[PDB]
Amino acid sequence: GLGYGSWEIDPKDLTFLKELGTGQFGVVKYGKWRGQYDVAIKMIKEGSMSEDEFIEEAKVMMNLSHEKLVQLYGVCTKQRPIFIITEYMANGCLLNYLREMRHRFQTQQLLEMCKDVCEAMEYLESKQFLHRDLAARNCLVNDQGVVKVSDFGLSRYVLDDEYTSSVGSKFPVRWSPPEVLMYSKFSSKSDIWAFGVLMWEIYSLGKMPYERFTNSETAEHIAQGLRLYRPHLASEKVYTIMYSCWHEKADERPTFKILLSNILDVMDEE
Numbered sequence: 369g370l371g372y373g374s375w376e377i378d379p380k381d382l383t384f385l386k387e388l389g390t391g392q393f394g395v396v397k398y399g400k401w402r403g404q405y406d407v408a409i410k411m412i413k414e415g416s417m418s419e420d421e422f423i424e425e426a427k428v429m430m431n432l433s434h435e436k437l438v439q440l441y442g443v444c445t446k447q448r449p450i451f452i453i454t455e456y457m458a459n460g461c462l463l464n465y466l467r468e469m470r471h472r473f474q475t476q477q478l479l480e481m482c483k484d485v486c487e488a489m490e491y492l493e494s495k496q497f498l499h500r501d502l503a504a505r506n507c508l509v510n511d512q513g514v515v516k517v518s519d520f521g522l523s524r525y526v527l528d529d530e531y532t533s534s535v536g537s538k539f540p541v542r543w544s545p546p547e548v549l550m551y552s553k554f555s556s557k558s559d560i561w562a563f564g565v566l567m568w569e570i571y572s573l574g575k576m577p578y579e580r581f582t583n584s585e586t587a588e589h590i591a592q593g594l595r596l597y598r599p600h601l602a603s604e605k606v607y608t609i610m611y612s613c614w615h616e617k618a619d620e621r622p623t624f625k626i627l628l629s630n631i632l633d634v635m636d637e638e
């Protein structure tokens with residue numbers, strides 16, 4: 369209505385119901401929009417985000433609609449702090465979900481999680497949109513057990529230099545290819561690398577990649593051509609898929625379309 373662009377939500381239309389957790393930018397809550405529609409509401413801590421740049425990008429993000437991408441519904445801009453309003457995912461982040469051993473996952477469920485993520489990423493690739501921080505911690509799980517990719521592209525707006533510098537204490541070293549660690553070369557193929565690490569996280573039930581190494585040791589290990597190895601739950605065929613994401617030469621890594629084909633082949637075979 370009057371006073372609001374298409375990317376803007378009236379915060380008065382929100383009802384807050386439950387605190388979900390705290391992340392990069394602060395508190396996240398579950399609520400309803402206009403009494404009826406489930407939403408997640410992220411309260412963006414002052415000083416954490418490049419807000420004007422994010423708001424301009426929100427206009428682009430609004431148009432990224434795929435069933436396996438967590439939808440951005442809009443932003444509450446008039447105010448301190450700003451809110452980001454997104455699709456509600458009742459079962460929380462994928463990393464925590466994998467780590468709950470009560471689920472007693474079958475490997476067919478693990479492969480389906482990989483396919484969910486791969487479908488989202490194939491869509492993003494088709495739009496020439498890089499995630500830039502793909503990892504289990506950036507995926508969410510809905511009440512049907514469907515995994516969706518969240519926070520795509522958001523790292524571009526983080527003001528904490530510990531996160532954004534490749535030498536920073538909070539940089540995603542363990543999800544980064546050599547050309548990122550060596551020279552900050554981001555590309556479709558750095559998202560591919562990260563996807564392989566995410567498949568490893570899924571098949572490892574949420575272990576930390578390179579869990580016995582520091583970030584510095586990990587960078588050395590991978591720059592020297594060594595890799596993660598096969599999780600016990602991954603078949604040879606699954607391991608081949610995640611390993612293909614880690615070619616030293618970026619141009620030899622598959623696309624998300626090829627990875628999706630490969631995952632579907634294994635689903636049919638196994």
Ligand SMILES: O=c1[nH]nc(-c2nc3ccccc3[nH]2)[nH]1
Nearest residue numbers: 388389408454455456457458460
């Ligand atoms: O953007 C979104 N949508 N949904 C969440 C969300 N759901 C959760 C459930 C439990 C814990 C933390 C959660 N965060 N974030």
